[PDB]
């Protein structure tokens, strides 16, 4: 059963084992059951923590239903893979990734008064060879000020930094003037769409190149895992993979009554159904009731 905060996260979700939890709840409200009152409680810390642990119950089955585009040629299987993660994060309640990491910067550094503190409280979320490349620019601009640069914007010393911080961002490859003119808007919507269509060709070149960099790491992890495995004899592999299957059944068979472990062994029995159903008719595949 659900606690109604799960079933509100599973309404716009699309995966299987959540939508059969929604369809079983939507059939119960139809049969004369009353809907629970949604609690207007658990102030800002518990409210943003339940969002962390309810969106991860939408992301986690959703990531497993997204086929990686490994060993593929072209940019369209990466634009498929990234768009499946865009539409997955939207079903889990996330916003656009540009909107969601810019929210992460202003959350970490609401009280950062110096530019060296905003470069060290948003350190985990910026590429480290870009964060370091903004420290040679911060140390160069610190020479002509000889005082700490403040996070003001109206300060002239911040404009001396942002004259050379923008100089890195174009050299990194990202058009900072098309980013900044997108999030500022424009007056007329005709020239607001000339910057919208140049932000979204950066952004589509942005979300692809790190969806592709996520694939090329899985391609290089699977090729180093396989080439470590092709060097073994076949008898070593058969007993190494039989102990790992035994110790991980045993970890789920010791934990009894837990929800995850009794759902784990229903997956082992459903894997064995797939092998048993293919073994009965292998030119057609598994048998679906249809």
């Amino acid at each position: 059963a659900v606690s109604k905060k799960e079933v509100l996260y599973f309404l716009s979700s699309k995966d299987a084992e959540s939508s059969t939890a929604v369809k079983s709840y939507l059939k119960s409200l139809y049969a004369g059951a009353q809907v629970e009152a949604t609690e207007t409680d658990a102030s800002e810390l518990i409210a943003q923590l339940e969002k962390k642990y309810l969106s991860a119950q939408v992301v986690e089955p959703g990531v497993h239903n997204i086929a990686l585009p490994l060993g593929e040629s072209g940019s369209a299987p990466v634009k498929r893979y990234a768009a499946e993660l865009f539409n997955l994060g939207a079903q889990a309640g996330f916003e656009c990734p540009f909107i969601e990491v810019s929210k992460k910067f202003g959350q970490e550094t609401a009280t950062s008064e110096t530019v060296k503190d905003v470069l060290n409280k948003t350190k985990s979320y910026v590429s480290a060879d870009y964060n370091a490349a903004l420290n040679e620019v911060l140390s160069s601009v610190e020479a002509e000020i000889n005082g700490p640069v403040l996070f003001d914007g109206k300060t002239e010393g911040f404009k001396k930094f942002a004259a050379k911080a923008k100089a890195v961002a174009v050299s990194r490859g990202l058009p900072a003037d098309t980013i900044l003119a997108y999030c500022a808007g424009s007056a007329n919507e005709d020239a607001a769409d000339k910057v919208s269509k140049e932000f979204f060709t950066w952004f589509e070149s942005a979300y692809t190149a790190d969806a592709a960099a996520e694939v090329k790491a899985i391609e290089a992890e699977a090729a180093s895992i396989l080439d470590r495995h092709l060097a073994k004899p076949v008898a070593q592999i058969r007993k190494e993979q039989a102990s790992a299957y035994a110790s991980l059944l045993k970890r789920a068979e010791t934990a009894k009554g837990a929800k995850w472990a009794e759902k784990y062994l229903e997956d082992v029995k459903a894997v064995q159904w797939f092998d048993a159903s293919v073994a009965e008719a292998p030119a057609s595949g598994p048998k679906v009731a249809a």
Binding site: D15, E17, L54, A258, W260
Partner: protein
């Protein structure tokens, strides 16, 4: 037995989702009572 379904077969099997749920069922009631009993 045989010939199960489609919506039973569409679920990804060994995803976590129930470790995340088991943590969220043991973290949230154990931290809802922490915020209502907190003085420095």
């Amino acid at each position: 037995a045989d010939a199960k379904a489609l919506d039973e077969l569409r679920k990804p099997k060994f995803s976590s989702k129930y470790l995340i749920q088991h943590v969220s069922q043991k973290l949230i009631p154990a931290v809802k009572e922490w915020e209502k009993s907190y003085q420095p």
